[PDB]
Amino acid sequence: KETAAAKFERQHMDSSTSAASSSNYCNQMMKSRNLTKDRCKPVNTFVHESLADVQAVCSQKNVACKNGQTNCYQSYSTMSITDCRETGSSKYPNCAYKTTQANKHIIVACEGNPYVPVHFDASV
Numbered sequence: 001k002e003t004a005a006a007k008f009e010r011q012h013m014d015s016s017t018s019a020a021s022s023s024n025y026c027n028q029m030m031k032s033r034n035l036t037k038d039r040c041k042p043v044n045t046f047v048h049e050s051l052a053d054v055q056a057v058c059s060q061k062n063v064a065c066k067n068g069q070t071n072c073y074q075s076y077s078t079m080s081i082t083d084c085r086e087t088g089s090s091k092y093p094n095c096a097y098k099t100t101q102a103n104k105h106i107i108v109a110c111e112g113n114p115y116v117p118v119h120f121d122a123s124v
């Protein structure tokens, strides 16, 4: 989605309503957020918190990134999230996902001025 920050909002933010989600949530959202255009993106996480709350994680607990960079941050509080995982029977362009709701700490990578999330690293 143009800027890395905009791409993070498109791929990972859903405070647009849902405090949680339904059984077809990932099927709809993986498609509507354009994560099934080129291929079936195999896994993706949506965060059901305010943009302000998720942007705030960039000033919280500094942790190592999976790629070995040092610009990752873990939320002090648990956040409402939805994990989407491509099913065994899923075949492009009919991408199929399991919708898993959870409350976990998020880990995001941050970059830029202003310093904002550009990558979803993990939930713990």
Ligand SMILES: Nc1ncnc2c1ncn2[C@@H]1O[C@H](COP(=O)(O)NCC(=O)O)[C@@H](O)[C@H]1O
Pocket (backbone or CB within 6 Å): 007, 008, 009, 011, 012, 065, 067, 069, 070, 071, 072, 109, 110, 111, 118, 119, 120, 121
């Ligand atoms: N530590 C990191 N800082 C900035 N980007 C990072 C990073 N660790 C991994 N990435 C990026 O992870 C990307 C692939 O996943 P993604 O960034 O699309 N995933 C969430 C997002 O950023 O919206 C690659 O382009 C990497 O450059």
